[PDB]
Design a protein around this nucleic acid. Structure first.
Lengths: 386, 136, 65
RNA sequence: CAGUCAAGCGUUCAUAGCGACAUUGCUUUUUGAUUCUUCGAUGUCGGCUCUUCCUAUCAUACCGAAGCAGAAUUCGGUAAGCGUUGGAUUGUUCACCCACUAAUAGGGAACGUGAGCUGGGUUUAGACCGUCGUGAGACAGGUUAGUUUUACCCUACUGAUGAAUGUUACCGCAAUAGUAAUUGAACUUAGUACGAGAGGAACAGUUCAUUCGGAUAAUUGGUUUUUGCGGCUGUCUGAUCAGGCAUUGCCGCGAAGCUACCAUCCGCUGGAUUAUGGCUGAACGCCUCUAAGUCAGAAUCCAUGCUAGAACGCGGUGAUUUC
RNA sequence: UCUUAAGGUAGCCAAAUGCCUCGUCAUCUAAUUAGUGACGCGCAUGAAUGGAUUAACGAGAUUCCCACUGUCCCUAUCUAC
RNA sequence: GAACAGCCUCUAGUUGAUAGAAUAAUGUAGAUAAGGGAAGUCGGCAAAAUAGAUCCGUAACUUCGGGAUAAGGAUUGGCU
């Protein structure tokens, strides 16, 4: 018979299987649509989620009942040292999809990227790309021919980049390597851009800009095996329940004589690849200066890094991006920032954002001060201060 | 409530589900208002309709002069006592939950407010603001 | 934005941080955090709580400012 | 539950909406009829929980017809994509009220679902009452108290490894499978269109909000074995200092971690179509949206997106074992 | 008038006893097949097959109110095994 | 401390219960939780709240014996 009272199903059927991601780094599933008129440009960047913080900004929403007033927003700060492009691969369109034709790497490969290629790096001969550089290490030995192959074929061109895990405060020492599509100019222009940018850094201030909606691709925080109540949000069974109440009572009817795929079951929670869209860049800042967290109103010389550093992460002395809201994945995790797949106005994507003040108080407790100078001024002299 | 609701309100954290008794902040002769339903509430199984600050609810007088008792009247919540977050990030709360009797349009039966009134409720209902002394 | 003074501990309250309480007397009390809020609701005197600015002023402590 | 015919009702104006007499069916959500399976047992009502399916569509999308003026409404088409609530009483299915709402539509899945729960009722043994019996006792008559057992096996499902295309590593493709967003209010349009007046709509717009979903912990709130700091009681360590014990002794704060529509962020646009309205245009020298051809067009479908990645589907790339 | 041996008296009642029945009126609630009070042509109450009442008492059976609370909105977190 | 209550200790006795590895889901036992306060449920089932002692005060009804710790309130430490 029918349910006595109707109710929406628990959970989303388009996000299963709720299994662990194939890798810690979440790849961009779909790159933005190619346009040949626009100049060759990276469609993505690789950053490291540093943490979260608070900003104050004047809301400019012409028509809201509370417009032109200060608002407090939560932002995510990601540490984005300039990604080193080395290598470029080509993709020919076939009745079977995009097929990789060839990949051409550069002369010098970084120790971090070779560590990425290795597993037991310390007990190894470090023999990687040696004969590749021997094929290379000339002016026109054999790499220009592969370049010509990618020009004559390979309707899609994807550059290969790796992160600066040494520049970031992580204890990883192993670079993250990914592909970024070039969505400008002809195939010849894409290959020329890739070759000129071979073996060098690309900056996120050049990739993205302020007041832009982007997509964060990341693997969510892992939570291990989980029951139905927190995995899917099902009801808790009453107090007087034999052999357990954190369970789904009925897992199926008599017929079909099988547990159905749509029934909520206990299993792995978290550590899923996710692509969140429409995240507004609130700031693209650099660490080659102080006053990163300083605005035109606060004008107090301070970096983005809170007092005592970002909790569990450290310092952001590199280039960084603060986007609005939350993004998938926890701190110390590699995230992929992709350009938006569509152009929407919505009176929310074109809204120019001018920050007033960025919360730099300690996140390691109920921090009261934003700078050590302010803390010292408030507290006066202490016993430890001579 | 339609014609009487002057504008929209941002999401205020719900703190008064059905069955809650709040103080009566006007001089209509009622002492407490018991919430039986909330206008504009959604439909989810097992979920109680919950009132927030500035919300219009259906209420009954459980303590007060007998003319208001044993019948249903519209009411407006003026104090929540459950912390809610404003746009400027401030989490504020009151000492008690309190509301005022009113007609379906929004006109109060009383002529004065005893105590403070939330800014959201005052902005939603001008007459409540007019009869309110302190608006926070 | 503007900073505030905790109604109990006398500390600058930055936007987003802290909480606000409205008594029946329509008096605004801004608390920097749950510690100050809990002390105030327990009705402890700031002049007798040792780490409060009111205590320091009452005891003439830190007069170098 | 749905058709057909049309005597009539609809202020003259059969079928806008109904429709007598009659008649044709469909339906296995009613109750009968039957006794085919089960009496070396298929756990029996209701509720809770959870998933899916049907359409005979209550609401939402787009339309056609009114005795459609406007505003509500009524009839019907595509249409099950998406929702269909909170309670008083009753064990209740069903009911009947209070309300909210866009709506509070009808059903199936062994009258879905007891090794999922509960046991209120039926449905053993105790007991009371009323009637019936001379009695023992009977009563789909009322009342009260009345053990709800087992999964570690196989499969199904949820996750997790894993041998074997020379090994190993990195970066990928995408067959297939799934898929998701939903509804309302307010301001303007506008006291305008319409209307004798009462009354009184739609917006291409702007701001919010129910409902659902995926994340996240900057902030707020919650949690405390941080037994981190402090306080307190009883006792013990001769006194202090410092501690032990009291299922974590109790109390106040309490970081970190986890977590809450109790907090915050985010949730895409293109094509092809149904109904329907049209173009050209015959059959049928006229007419005709149709016969050929063709335009627009739905919450529909398929893609763009999103999740998994075939462990027997693949590509490119680095290295590939001196005594 | 029929009629029995007498024809239910005092009391009580939709009562643990009333089928119809969720009886009718009032109250309790916003809403009550529940509860209480009242009414009795009472299917089929009733006087030691004891009737009515009753202070105190009850791990007896129902209703309401105050307090209180994770029973619930709507779940979250901690410890030991 | 009112107490062969509970809690700690002296004499005496034992240190016996298969062990090891920071513990996932669901359990068993023990607990907290913002706002609401029975809206849950057949039903306040289970938990919570109350609680000792000294003062103040204590209703209907009653078989005058009770009800009664009715209901409600206030104090409680240490030191001299």
């Amino acid at each position: 018979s029918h349910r006595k009272y109707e109710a929406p199903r628990h959970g989303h059927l388009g996000f299963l299987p709720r299994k662990r991601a194939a890798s810690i780094r979440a790849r961009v599933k779909a790159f933005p649509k190619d346009d040949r008129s626009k100049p060759v440009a990276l469609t993505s960047f690789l950053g490291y989620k540093a943490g979260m913080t608070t900003i104050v900004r004047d809301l400019d929403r012409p028509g809201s009942k509370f417009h032109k007033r200060e608002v407090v927003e939560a932002v995510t700060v990601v540490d984005t040292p300039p990604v080193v492009v080395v290598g470029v691969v080509g993709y020919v369109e076939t009745p079977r999809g995009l097929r990789s034709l060839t990949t051409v790497w550069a002369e010098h490969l970084s120790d971090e990227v070779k560590r990425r290629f290795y597993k037991n790096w310390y007990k190894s001969k470090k023999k990687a790309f040696t004969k590749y550089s021997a094929k290379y290490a000339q002016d026109g030995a054999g790499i220009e021919r592969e370049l010509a192959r990618i020009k004559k074929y390979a309707s899609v061109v994807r550059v290969l980049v790796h992160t600066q895990i040494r520049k970031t405060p992580l204890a990883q020492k192993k670079a993250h390597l990914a592909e970024i599509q070039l969505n400008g100019g002809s195939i010849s222009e894409k290959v020329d851009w890739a070759r000129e940018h071979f073996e060098k850094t690309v900056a996120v201030d050049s990739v993205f800009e302020q007041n832009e909606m982007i997509d964060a691709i990341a693997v969510t925080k892992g939570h291990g095996f989980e029951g139905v109540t927190h995995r899917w949000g099902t009801k808790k069974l009453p107090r007087k329940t034999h052999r357990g109440l954190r369970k789904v009572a009925c897992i199926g009817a008599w017929h079909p004589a099988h547990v159905m795929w749509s029934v909520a079951r206990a299993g792995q929670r978290g550590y899923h690849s996710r692509t969140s869209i429409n995240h507004k860049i609130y700031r693209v800042g650099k660490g080659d200066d102080e006053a990163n967290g300083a605005t035109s109103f606060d004008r107090t010389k301070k970096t983005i890094t809170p007092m005592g550093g970002f909790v569990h992460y450290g310092e952001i002395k590199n280039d960084f991006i603060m986007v609005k809201g939350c993004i998938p994945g926890n701190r110390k995790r590699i995230v992929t920032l992709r350009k938006s797949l569509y152009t929407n106005t919505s009176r929310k994507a074109l809204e120019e954002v001018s920050l007033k003040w960025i919360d730099t108080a300690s996140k390691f407790g109920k921090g009261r001060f934003q700078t050590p100078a302010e803390k010292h001024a408030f507290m006066g002299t202490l016993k430890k201060d001579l | 409530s339609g014609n009487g609701a002057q504008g929209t309100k941002f999401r205020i954290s719900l703190g008064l589900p059905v069955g809650a008794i709040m103080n009566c902040a006007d001089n209509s002769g009622a002492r407490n208002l018991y919430i039986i339903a909330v206008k504009g509430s959604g439909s989810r199984l097992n979920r109680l309709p919950a009132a927030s600050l500035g919300d219009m609810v259906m209420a009954t007088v459980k303590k007060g002069k007998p003319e208001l008792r044993k019948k249903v009247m519209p009411a407006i919540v003026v104090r929540q006592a459950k912390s809610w977050r404003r746009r400027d990030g401030v989490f504020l709360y009151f000492e008690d939950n309190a509301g005022v009797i009113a007609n379906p349009k929004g006109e109060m039966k009383g002529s004065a407010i005893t105590g403070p009134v939330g800014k959201e409720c005052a902005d939603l209902w001008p007459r409540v603001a007019s009869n309110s002394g302190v608006v926070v | 934005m503007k900073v505030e003074i905790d109604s109990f501990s006398g500390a600058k309250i930055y936007p987003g941080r802290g909480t606000l309480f409205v008594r029946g007397d329509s008096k605004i009390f801004r608390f920097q955090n749950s510690k100050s809020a809990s002390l105030f609701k327990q009705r402890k005197n700031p002049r007798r709580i040792a780490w409060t600015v009111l205590f320091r002023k009452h005891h003439k402590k830190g007069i170098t400012e």
